[PDB]
Amino acid sequence: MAIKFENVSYVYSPGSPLEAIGLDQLNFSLEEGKFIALVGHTGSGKSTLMQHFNALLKPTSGKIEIAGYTITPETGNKGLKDLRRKVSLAFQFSEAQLFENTVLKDVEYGPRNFGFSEDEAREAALKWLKKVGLKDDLIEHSPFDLSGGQMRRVALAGVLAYEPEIICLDEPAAGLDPMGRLEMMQLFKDYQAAGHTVILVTHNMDDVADYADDVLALEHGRLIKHASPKEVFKDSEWLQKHHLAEPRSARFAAKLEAAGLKLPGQPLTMPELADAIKQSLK
Amino acid sequence: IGRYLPGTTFVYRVDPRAKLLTTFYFIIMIFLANNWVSYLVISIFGLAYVFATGLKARVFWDGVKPMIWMIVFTSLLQTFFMAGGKVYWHWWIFTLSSEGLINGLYVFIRFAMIILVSTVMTVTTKPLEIADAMEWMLTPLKLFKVNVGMISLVISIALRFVPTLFDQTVKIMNAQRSRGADFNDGGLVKRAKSVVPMLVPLFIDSLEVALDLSTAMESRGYKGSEGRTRYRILEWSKVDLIPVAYCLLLTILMITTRK
Amino acid sequence: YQLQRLTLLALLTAMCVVLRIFKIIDIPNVQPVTDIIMLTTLELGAGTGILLAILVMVISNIFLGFGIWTLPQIFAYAACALTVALFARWLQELLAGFLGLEYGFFVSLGMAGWGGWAAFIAYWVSGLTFDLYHAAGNLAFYPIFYLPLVLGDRFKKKA
Amino acid sequence: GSDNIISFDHVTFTYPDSPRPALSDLSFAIERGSWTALIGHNGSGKSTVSKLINGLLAPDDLDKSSITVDGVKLGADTVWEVREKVGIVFQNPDNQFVGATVSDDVAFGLENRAVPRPEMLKIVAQAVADVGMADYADSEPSNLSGGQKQRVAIAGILAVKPQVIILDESTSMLDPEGKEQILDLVRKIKEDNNLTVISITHDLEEAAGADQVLVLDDGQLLDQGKPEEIFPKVEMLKRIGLDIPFVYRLKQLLKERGIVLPDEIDDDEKLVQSLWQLNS
C-alpha cells in the first residue's frame, strides 16, 4: 500500500536508455489511502502508464514496487489473481468488457477468476450491483438491455467486485452526462477512503480540485511533476509551457482578480471560490 | 498496415495497378515452359526488378521458414527426368546427368519466382493501394449481375477498420483482466471458452456499428448507385511504361525460340 | 429498400480478417482456422452470396499482407470459398464433410497438381492439421454460435 | 422565423410500445437561425429528435403530427431532399468514417449527388481546411486521434452545403477540453455561414452558451425558453434530475455565500463585470 517507481520505462520496441518516447523517467512515491491523479495533455503518459501498475505491461529499465507484489522487466505469469485482485485498472469506456447473459455473471466474473464459489461471489456480485447504484430491478438481469451508465456500473462493478486494494481508472465515467459522473465519483471517495489507493487517469481539472489529494502529471512522454492540487496551478506558465489547463473554479479568480477584486488566493474549487468572492467584496 | 513497406526512397515500383497487371502476367506469362530463353531469362529477367527492390536478403525466410515440407518435398516428385508423375513417358526415372537434373531443378526458378514477384507486391505497395488496383479491373464487371460498386465501398471500409478492430479487439483482452482471465489454457475436449470475454463484445462492433455506420452513410446523400461520383483515384505518369514493356519484351523473349 | 446488409459485410468482414490476424498480443488462435464462427451465423437467416463475399472479402483483404496463412505461399483464396459456395446450398457434419472431402480437396489438390497428376503429397502432410481443425471447431458451435452469435444477429438488422 | 415544427410528436420503439413510449408529447418548435440545446434525463427519448428530421425515423406516423420545414416535409419520396436541407454530425465519429483519408469522407457526400470531382477537390479542401485539416491531409481514421474525427465530420456537411447543422450527442466521449475546441468550430460556421446548429444534452456551453434550451422527462417538455429562463428552475430539475451551469452553480454558491445579484446573469461576461460592481 505504498506504490513507487524507481525507475520505469516502456518503449514498445527494443533499446535502453533510448530514447525518450512512451514513458520516460517515471519516478515518484505514492501513498495508501489517497486520491491520485493521472493528468496532463493527451499524448504523454496516462493510458500508456496506467497499464503498467497491475502488470498488464512491465517496465524496461527498473521496477514497479507496489501493493504486495512487484513488477520487474523480466516478469512472468505467476501470482496474478491476487495481484490483479489487489490492482484493477478501469479503462476508457469499460462497458465494453460485457459478454455474459446475466449481468450478475459479469459481476460474478470479478470474484470468480479470483477464487470464490458462486454463492459467496453472489454476495460480491449482489453487493456490487446494489452498492454501485442500481435499483430493485437491476440487482440482477440480462446485461445489455440497460443504459451505458447502468452498464458502466456493471463495467465498474465487474472490475470492483473483489474490492481491489488499488483501483486505477482510465476516465471510467467518460461519456456520462451531468448526473451519471457525479454519482460514480463520490462513490470513489467512500471506497477510496476504505484505505484504498484510488488512482485516476483523466484531464478533468475540476476533479483534482473536487476529488483529489495528490496528483501526477506528465507531458510529451516525460514526467513533468508528481504533485498535489495546490503546488500545481499557481503559475499559469506551467499550464502554458507544459500543456495542461485549470478548473473553471480556478480559471475565474483571474477573471475576477483582473477587475480589482483580487480574490483571497487561487482557490480552484466551487464552494471555496465563492467564500473568496465574499471575503474580498467586504 | 501491414507488411511490408513503401520504403524511402526506392526506385520506381509505382502505379499499384500496373504491378497487378504485371504480377499476374508474370504467372500468366511463365506458363508455356519449354526452353532456355524462358528460364535463364525469367529467372533473371523476371527477377531483374525483384532484386532492384534491393531490400535485405533475410526477408524471404519469412516466406519459407516455418514449413519446408513442400518445396524440396514436392518438386522432388518432379525429379523423374520425364514427367515426374505418374510417369507415364517414358522409360527412365532417376538421373544425375545433363537432362534429369535440369527438369526438376528447372522448377526451383519457374515457381519460386512467382512467390518473389508476389512478395514484392505486398512489399512495395500501400495496402490502400494494393486495394485500389483490385478494384480498378473490378468495377468493369457491369456486364453480369453487376453488384460492383457495393464491394468497392467495403474495401475502403473493410480496411478502415482492420486497425480499429485489432486496436479494440485487444483492449477487450486487457479490459478483461480486471475480471480475469483465461486465455492460453489448453484442452482439446476441455477448454476453448477462453476467447469468450473478447468475441462476445467483438460481434457487437460488427453488428451494432454497421447500423450506426450505415445511417450516416445513408443520411448524407447515399441513395447508393445510381448517382454516386467518387474521389479515390491516382494518375499514371510518363514513368509507368516500365512494367508495360517488362511484359512486352517478354512476349518476344518468350516465343523467340518457338518463334 | 431493406439495405444496411452490405455496410455490415464491410464490418463483419473487418472482424473475420481481424480474427485470423489473432488479436496477436495474446493470440487466442491456438491451431488452425478459427474464423468460421460468424460464417454459419450467415446461413442462419442472412444469405447465400453473403457467405461467399465475406471470405473473398477476407482471403483478398487480408492477403495483404503478407498473405497466405495456413500453407507456405501464394494460392488458396476461393478454393477456400468452395467450402463456402456450397455452405447452406448440425454441428457434427459442418466439420465432417468439410473435414473429409470438402475442405482440402480444393485447396492443395489444386495447388499440388497442375499437369494432371498426383496430389496427396503436400495435400495431407496436413493430415493431422486437418483433423486438428475440428477439436474445438466442432465444440465451437456449442459456446458462441447458437445463443450469442445468432440471437443478437437478428435484433440489430431487419429494421 | 421558425425553422422546425415538431408538433405533439412521438416515437415508439419496436417492442417497447405499451411499456415505454419514447416521447408521447413535445410539442416544440425551433427558431430559424438559433443554436438550440435539448436537455433532459437520459431516457427522455431526445437523442432521437434528430433522426425524425432526416427520415432515419418514420416512428409512429407522418400525417397526424409530421415534421415540416418551410421548404419540405417528412416524409415522401422527397425524404432524401431533406438530407440536403439538413446535415448531422453524430456521437462516435470513428464509425461513420467512410473513407480512410480525410478528403474521402468529406467528399462522399458530393459523391452521391452528381457533383464533379474537380469541383469536389475544392469544396473539400476549404471544407477540410476550414477545420484545420490541410496538414492532416489523408490520415487514416483508425489511427486518427478521437478529437479530430469530429472535425473531419463537420466538414462532411460543408462539402454538401446544407441549410441546417445538427448535433446528435456529439462531443460526449470527448475530452473536457476536446469539446470546447470543436464546439467553437461550429459557432464560427454560425458566423462564417449563418446556419442553425441544433444541439442535444450536455451542460454549460452546450446548454447556457446556447440561444435556447428544452428540458424533457420522460419524453415530455417544460421550459422551451432560453437557457437562462430554464435552469433557474433548479428544483423541478433535480426531480427531472439535472445540473445547472457553473454560471448558475456559483450564483447560488454566492446567494448562499452572500452575493445575491439578480437571477438573470448568464454571460461569463456577466459574472466578471457584475462582480466588481460589488467591491466598492
Numbering used by the authors:
A (entry chain C): 1 to 282
B (entry chain D): 6 to 264
C (entry chain A): 7 to 95, 106 to 175
D (entry chain B): 1 to 280
Authors' own words:
We crystallized the ECF-CbrT complex in detergent (n-Dodecyl-β-D-maltopyranoside, DDM) solution and solved a crystal structure to 3.4 Å resolution using molecular replacement with the structure of the folate transporter, ECF-FolT2, from L. delbrueckii as a search model. There are two copies of ECF-CbrT in the asymmetric unit, corresponding to molecules A and B, each of them comprising CbrT, EcfT, EcfA and EcfA’. In both complexes, the two nucleotide-binding domains (NBDs; EcfA and EcfA’) are in a nucleotide-free state, adopting an open conformation with two incomplete ATP-binding sites. CbrT is in a ‘toppled’ orientation in the ECF-CbrT complex with TMs 1, 2, 3 and 4 oriented almost parallel to the membrane plane. Although OH-Cbl was added in excess to the crystallization condition, the substrate was not bound. The apo-state of the toppled S-component was observed before in other ECF-type transporters and likely represents the inward-facing state after substrate release. We hypothesize that the binding site for Cbl is located in a large cavity observed in the CbrT structure. In contrast to ECF-FolT2, and structurally characterized ECF complexes from other organisms, the binding cavity in ECF-CbrT is largely occluded, and not accessible from the cytosol. The occlusion is caused mainly by the position of loop 3, which obstructs access to the cavity in CbrT. We speculate that occlusion of the empty binding site after cytoplasmic release of the substrate may be required for the subsequent reorientation of the S-component, upon release from the ECF module.
ECF-transporters are multi-subunit membrane complexes that consist of two ATPases, similar to the ATPases of ABC transporters, and two membrane embedded proteins, not related to any other protein family. The two ATPases and one of the transmembrane proteins, EcfT, form the ‘energizing unit’ or ’ ECF-module’. The other membrane protein, termed S-component, acts as the substrate-binding protein and dynamically associates with the ECF-module to allow for substrate translocation. We demonstrate that ECF-CbrT is a Cbl transporter that catalyses ATP-dependent uptake of Cbl and its precursor Cbi.
